[PDB]
Amino acid sequence: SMEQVAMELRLTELTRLLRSVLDQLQDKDPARIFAQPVSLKEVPDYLDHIKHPMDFATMRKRLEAQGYKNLHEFEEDFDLIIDNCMKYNARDTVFYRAAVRLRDQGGVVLRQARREVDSIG
């Protein structure tokens, strides 16, 4: 149907915007602390602590299969990145502090992205 095609064009356009949002969020992590999943080889207890691991590469794979239906879903995965880090790592660590900075900086990007997703529809 033409209705389905038009839904697909909307998903594709959301996917384009979200890809730019993702690159902008990832520049707020120049150290690349959140670029890849936490290795179970190097933190074998990780899944005892953190029930839903998330990282930028995993977000990217989901994105390129157009697996984000809306900005809320994407924000959930972003928030997991930050929130997981701030529970597993202590306040006095390079990791926790890198999450704070990503959160603060990312919030600016997401504030406008939310207006662009409403605005462009």
Curated annotation (Swiss-Prot):
Compartments where found: Nucleus; Chromosome
Cross-link for Glycyl lysine isopeptide (Lys-Gly) (interchain with G-Cter in SUMO2), residue positions: K41
Tissues expressed in: Highly expressed in testis.
Domain Bromo: 9-113
Domain of life: Eukaryota
Quaternary data: Component of some HBO1 complex composed of KAT7/HBO1, MEAF6, ING4 and BRD1/BRPF2. Component of the MOZ/MORF complex composed at least of ING5, KAT6A, KAT6B, MEAF6 and one of BRPF1, BRD1/BRPF2 and BRPF3. Interacts (via PHD-type zinc finger domain) with unmodified histone H3. Interacts (via PWWP domain) with dimethylated and trimethylated 'Lys-79' on histone H3.
Entry function: Scaffold subunit of various histone acetyltransferase (HAT) complexes, such as the MOZ/MORF and HBO1 complexes, that acts as a regulator of hematopoiesis. Plays a key role in HBO1 complex by directing KAT7/HBO1 specificity towards histone H3 'Lys-14' acetylation (H3K14ac), thereby promoting erythroid differentiation.
Entry protein name: Bromodomain-containing protein 1
Organism: Homo sapiens (Human)
Gene name for this UniProt entry: BRD1
